[PDB]
From a paper:
The [name] Tat protein bound to a host super elongation complex (SEC) recognizes [name] and releases the paused polymerase. [name] Tat binds simultaneously to [name] and positive elongation factor b (P-[name]), composed of [name] and Cyclin T1 ([name]) subunits. In turn, P-[name] and the transcriptional elongation factors ELL2 and ENL/AF9 associate with hydrophobic segments in the approximately 1200-amino-acid AFF1 or [name] scaffold, together forming the SEC. P-[name] triggers promoter escape by phosphorylating two negative elongation factors (DSIF and NELF), as well as the C-terminal domain (CTD) of Pol II.
To define the structural basis for the increased affinity of the [name]-P-[name] complex for Tat, we determined the crystal structure of the quaternary complex of P-[name] with AFF42–73 and Tat1–57. Tat and [name] bind adjacent to each other on the [name] surface. [name] residues 34- to 69-fold on the [name] surface, making multiple direct contacts with Tat K28, F32, and E2 and burying Tat M1. The nexus of the Tat–[name] interface, Tat K28, is partially buried in a hydrophobic pocket formed by the side chains of [name] M62, F65, and Tat F32, and the main chain of [name] helix 2, residues 59–63. The Tat K28 side-chain amino group forms a hydrogen bond with the [name] E61 main-chain carbonyl at the pocket edge facing the solvent. Compared to the [name]-P-[name] complex, [name] structural segments in the Tat-[name]-P-[name] complex undergo unanticipated 1–2 Å backbone shifts to avoid unfavorable close contacts with Tat. In contrast to the Tat-P-[name] complex, in which the [name] TRM is disordered between residues 253 and 260, this functionally important segment is ordered in two conformations in the Tat-[name]-P-[name] complex. [name] residues 253–259 loop over Tat helix 28–33 in two conformations that converge at [name] C261. C261 binds the shared Tat Zn2+ ion in all three complexes. In all complexes, W256 makes buried contacts with [name].
Author numbering:
A (entry chain B): 7 to 261
B (entry chain D): 1 to 49
C (entry chain A): 8 to 88, 97 to 330
D (entry chain C): 4 to 21, 33 to 69
């Protein structure tokens, strides 16, 4: 039962280290989403793989099943996690570069601190420390499996169109950003939920195989239609609770 | 946003940086410019104040 | 500051220093309550320039994956109330030490067994898409019961069979210089398992010479020593070696004939042994023997058959 | 007992340590509650599909 270490029940998620310090469920979930968004932004500026960002996000999710947002702000943890993930996923970025990108994101007003300043070397010390804390908190379990792997593999099998492949993959990223599925269900299960959701939206339908089995049976042997509907439900529920509550805020105008 | 063949080795994966810089326009195209834009513009999630 | 999945290293008692690793100091220690021996490899975060070393991260990742009788075993990772310690299963001996020890004498049978276990280990890690990238006598451990263990994966990494297309650009300056193969010295960055087997050849020669066979001081010096011993590096013996940007930029001696068997003849004596070393120190990695072919070589299945080390080690 | 056999037995010990679907189609009806919900919330898929991903 070493798997169930980084997988939790709803009772455990409800009793988070942050709940322990008086942080509302919706507010903690918000803090996670912001960290994910910050990780994604920084990652895109650093130009690392999405894999790196995704790994960094799972670290963050797991970090806060042990530590509290009270004690460790997301905006301090996030650059450390990404810096670590960058190495693990074989696209390492210079520590100088990360602190730069992090500064740009969190302080667009301030000027980029001097590389010699006492204040800059303090930023370095904090990042390197947090990395060490993240590593120890995770028990040096740094190998992460993502839904994207199984999503892409599955869409090839079922001969999906580019849009359906794109959308399924897109929902996989959204699952990491907006939910705590990475802490509840294994990547193959989440992959199905994403594909299932993309299908219900697009009205694409995946038939049964030549051997009479549903597509998700080729992804995970524990998944059932009952589970998929129920999780797609929960996924949508999380989507509504986002700010802008899904309303279409664009303008139908030029630029 | 864009799928990546998982069979690629980690050091082979393309970078996540979009070809074009993120704007402040809120048109449909710009709200789905990239993952960051979608999460921040379309869904209203931000880490900054 | 909670930390449930990282025990304190206090549970172990350091007994002595036992060498310098890829990124740390290494200590022999015994568990305070059970007496179980371990090797603590301390991650030296002196280099806070890039935080936790990616070099150490790879070792931890890789050894959590690899599990084999001839690969060293990672037990856990410990902290101090801070510095990090990698905790390995302890091995009484290392091959370099044994070869330097004058009281240690190998029978031919025992050498066969050492090389057999070594190549078995290399065979395993290679099929799991891992390069060791630091094959040398000092990184080969042997337990009290005479079981060989490949160790110090600080320099190891995963590699690809990619993809009839865009080739890899791995790190070039790897492997201890003395055991570094020709292609790396010529700047190859799309290499593979053969680089480890070059080292296996170098180590196999040491089993009889009791001293590293090519001790260069620079990459050019090492290349020169290789040329003298293995013959001149030429397209005739190594197709498309021309294509290396540095092939002419370095100026390589052209006269040298191959003298591998000639020079090792007096020390090794065994015919099959000489042949296997000859196939391991082939210049062109495409023509260099591989783990599987090596392990089926007559050297391992002719008399005297390999025997257990346990005997020789107690002296 | 022979070397060839003892050799092969070891070669193997070494070694032992190491269209299903039709093309998906559109479905106008019947509609289920899940789909109906999703479409009401995310909107019309075809209006969005060319914005999610690359062209
Ligand atoms: N378990 C061990 N037993 C003996 N020496 C070791 C052990 N681990 C590492 N070393 C030594 O550490 C150095 C390389 O890390 C070599 O000198 C090697 O012999
Ligand atoms: Zn616009
Ligand atoms: Zn953008």
């Amino acid at each position: 039962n070493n798997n169930k270490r980084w997988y939790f029940t709803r009772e455990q998620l409800e009793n988070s280290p942050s709940r322990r310090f008086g942080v509302d469920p919706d507010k903690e979930l918000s803090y996670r989403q912001q960290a994910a968004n910050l990780l994604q932004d920084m990652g895109q500026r650093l130009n690392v793989s999405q894999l790196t960002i995704n790994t960094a996000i799972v670290y963050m999710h797991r970090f806060y099943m042990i530590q509290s947002f009270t004690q460790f702000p997301g905006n301090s943890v996030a650059p450390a996690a990404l810096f670590l993930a960058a190495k693990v996923e074989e696209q390492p970025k210079k520590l100088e570069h990360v602190i730069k990108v992090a500064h740009t994101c969190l302080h667009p007003q301030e000027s980029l601190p001097d590389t010699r300043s006492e204040a800059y070397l303090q930023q370095v010390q904090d990042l390197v420390i947090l990395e060490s804390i993240i590593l120890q908190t995770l028990g040096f379990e740094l190998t992460i499996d993502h839904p994207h792997t199984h999503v892409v593999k599955c869409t090839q099998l079922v001969r999906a169109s580019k849009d359906l492949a794109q959308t399924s993959y897109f929902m996989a990223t959204n699952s990491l950003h907006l939910t705590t599925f990475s802490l509840q269900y294994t990547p193959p299960v989440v992959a199905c939920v994403c594909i299932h959701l993309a299908c219900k939206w697009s009205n694409w339908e995946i038939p049964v195989s030549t051997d009479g089995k549903h597509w998700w049976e080729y992804v995970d042997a524990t998944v059932t239609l009952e589970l998929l509907d129920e999780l797609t439900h929960e996924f949508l529920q999380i989507l509504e609770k986002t700010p802008n509550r899904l309303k279409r805020i664009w303008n139908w105008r030029a630029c | 946003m864009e799928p990546v063949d998982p069979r690629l080795e980690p050091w082979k994966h393309p970078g996540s940086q979009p070809k074009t810089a993120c704007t402040n326009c809120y048109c449909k195209k710009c709200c789905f410019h990239c993952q960051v834009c979608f999460i921040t513009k379309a869904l209203g999630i931000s880490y900054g104040r | 500051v909670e930390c449930p999945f990282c025990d304190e290293v206090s549970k172990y008692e350091k007994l002595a220093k036992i060498g310098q690793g890829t990124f740390g100091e290494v200590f022999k220690a015994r568990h305070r309550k059970t007496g179980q021996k371990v090797a603590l490899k301390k991650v030296l975060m002196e280099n806070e320039k890039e935080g936790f070393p990616i070099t150490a991260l790879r070792e931890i990742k890789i050894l959590q994956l690899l599990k084999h009788e001839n690969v060293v075993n990672l037990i856990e990772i410990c902290r101090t109330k801070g510095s990090i310690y990698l905790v390995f299963d302890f091995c009484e001996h290392d091959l370099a030490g044994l070869l330097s020890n004058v009281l240690v004498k190998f029978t031919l049978s025992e050498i066969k067994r050492v090389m057999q276990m070594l190549l078995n280990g290399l065979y395993y890690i290679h099929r799991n898409k891992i390069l060791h990238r630091d094959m040398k006598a000092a990184n080969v451990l042997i337990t009290r019961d005479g079981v060989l263990k490949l160790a110090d994966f600080g320099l190891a990494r995963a590699f690809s069979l990619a993809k009839n297309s865009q080739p890899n650009r791995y790190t070039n300056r790897v492997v201890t210089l003395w055991y570094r193969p020709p292609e790396l010295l010529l700047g190859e960055r799309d290499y593979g398992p053969p680089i480890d087997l070059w080292g296996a050849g170098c180590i196999m020669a040491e089993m009889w010479t009791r001293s590293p066979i090519m001790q260069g001081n620079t990459e050019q010096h090492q290349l020169a020593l290789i040329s003298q011993l293995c013959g001149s590096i030429t397209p005739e013996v190594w197709p498309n070696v021309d294509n290396y940007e540095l092939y002419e930029k370095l100026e390589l001696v052209k006269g040298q004939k191959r003298k591998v068997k000639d020079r090792l003849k007096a020390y090794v004596r065994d015919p099959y042994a000489l042949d296997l070393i000859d196939k391991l120190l082939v210049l062109d990695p495409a023509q260099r023997i591989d783990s599987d072919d090596a392990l089926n070589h007559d050297f391992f299945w002719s008399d005297p058959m390999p025997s257990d080390l346990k005997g020789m080690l107690s002296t | 007992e022979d070397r060839n056999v003892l050799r092969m037995k070891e070669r193997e010990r070494r070694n032992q340590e190491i269209p299903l679907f039709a093309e998906p189609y559109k479905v106008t009806s019947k509609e289920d509650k899940l789909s109906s919900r999703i479409q009401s919330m995310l909107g019309n898929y075809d209006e969005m599909k060319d914005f999610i991903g690359d062209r």
